[PDB]
Amino acid sequence: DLSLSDINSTVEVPEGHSFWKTLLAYSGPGALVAVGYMDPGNWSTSITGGQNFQYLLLSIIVISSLLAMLLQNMAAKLGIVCQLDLAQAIRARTSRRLGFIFWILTELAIMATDIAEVIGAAIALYLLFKIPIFLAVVITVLDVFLLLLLNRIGFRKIEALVVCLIFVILFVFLYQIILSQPAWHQVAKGLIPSWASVQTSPKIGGQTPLSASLGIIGATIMPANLFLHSAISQSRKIDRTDSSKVAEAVRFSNWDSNIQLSLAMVVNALLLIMGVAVFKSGAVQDPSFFGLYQALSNPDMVSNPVLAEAARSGVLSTLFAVALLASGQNSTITGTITGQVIMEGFIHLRLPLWLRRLVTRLIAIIPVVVCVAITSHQGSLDEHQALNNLMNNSQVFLALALPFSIVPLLMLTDSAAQMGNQFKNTRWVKVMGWLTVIILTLLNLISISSQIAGFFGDNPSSQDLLLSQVISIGIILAMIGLLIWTIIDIRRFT
């Protein structure tokens, strides 16, 4: 009846004021959440953002990360104080049909992330081991056994294995930056919140600073990782009777989460400066993983003789594909954990980790093998580009499931009927939190129409455009109705 019954309140190791060892104990949840923010689903969009705007967008990254650190922390609080996840809170404060709508929506979000991870991992196999594109996918389907071995390890070593992947993809991209020797002064100048990123005048590669910036801000959080954080934050036993120990617990999970999401921010920065210093200006014409592989393997694309010799040897591209693999392993862990959370929390369905990863991976790979089937039927022409367009079109479910995850979180944590007058949010995080939630909801409701119109490709059929407008209006209005309904129920609780 409690979230993550297998590992809930497992190891509590606060030992007086020995703070840093205590920090070493529970440092896992923050890493498990942060590794999701390093998925390849936006890698290109960083590199592109670097080529179109050298170091300019870095600040935006920071801001985004900060916002992601805010809401995530809030989720952790809801897990630490209430001893229950966000899905159990929402489902407890609303009917079953709304918990079922939220269930299918979040299932579609983690399914989209899973599509990104299976595409990036399969392509990673096509690049490293030269496995055929169709075989690499059905090889990625075999991650259920890696989940079986994953199940016997334990969170003290699982949550450190996630750290291992994090520093794998962090040192892979940091190594290619170390060889690049970039002008770190311009990097520092880019990290400052300037007003050149909010303008619309450069328009390089069909992208203005305000468009790229608002895109980075819009994709700030992932809805599944909020439920994830609220569930894994409970894995540390708390008496819930000593205010100093629960306040300490909040400081604990906060410093952990910021320590890891800061690493994710560093990875995004390494991708932007990867697009600025490593690649030449405008050398990246194919945002696909294969386009970045050959672009990292062509000496004329880099801007340094050392990177030309190393690229001719073929080490940059291979490291890139290794990073693709290490990123593609995340959805096997966090996808199953979060899927269990939303499942047994929203619809009260107890399912094992076997059929979970089976069903999610199959539903994820169906459109992938359909895309590879059509493109390989066209002669393997534009197959990687179509895989990239599938990966980017999948991300609409995140925008569909975002407000129903950030609004109920902010409401339930701001109310004293869930946190109490002692552990509710400060008047500071009330303003910052409501501002961020409004901005993200507006931006994603804007993104719905753009992605739905993007489903029809770059060929604008005049009759299909109006249909995309009708479908977009219907979807955003339906999300408005669901949003005001959830607002009404939660505010009836408070």
CATH numbers and ranges of domains, the chain: 19-382 (1.10.4160.10)
Cβ atoms within 10 Å of 319's Cβ, excluding its own? 19
Q: Write down the experimental method used for this entry.
A: X-ray
Distance CA 248, CA 239 (A): 12
Both tokens of 253, joined, read: 């999970």
What angle in degrees, to the nearest 10, is found between the helix axes of 223-232 and 330-342? 80
Distance CA 4, CA 29 (A): 13
What single letter denotes the amino acid at residue 22? T
DSSP conformational letter for 130: -
Distance CA 359, CA 171 (A): 33
Work out the burial of residue 234: count CB atoms within 10 Å of its CB; fewer than 13 is exposed, 13-18 middle, 19 or more buried.
buried
Contact by Cβ (8 Å): 137, 237: no
Question: What b/e sequence results for 270-308 when a residue is b if at least 16 CB atoms lie within 10 Å of its CB, and e otherwise?
Answer: bbbbbbbbbbeeebbebbbbbbbbebbbbeebbebeebe
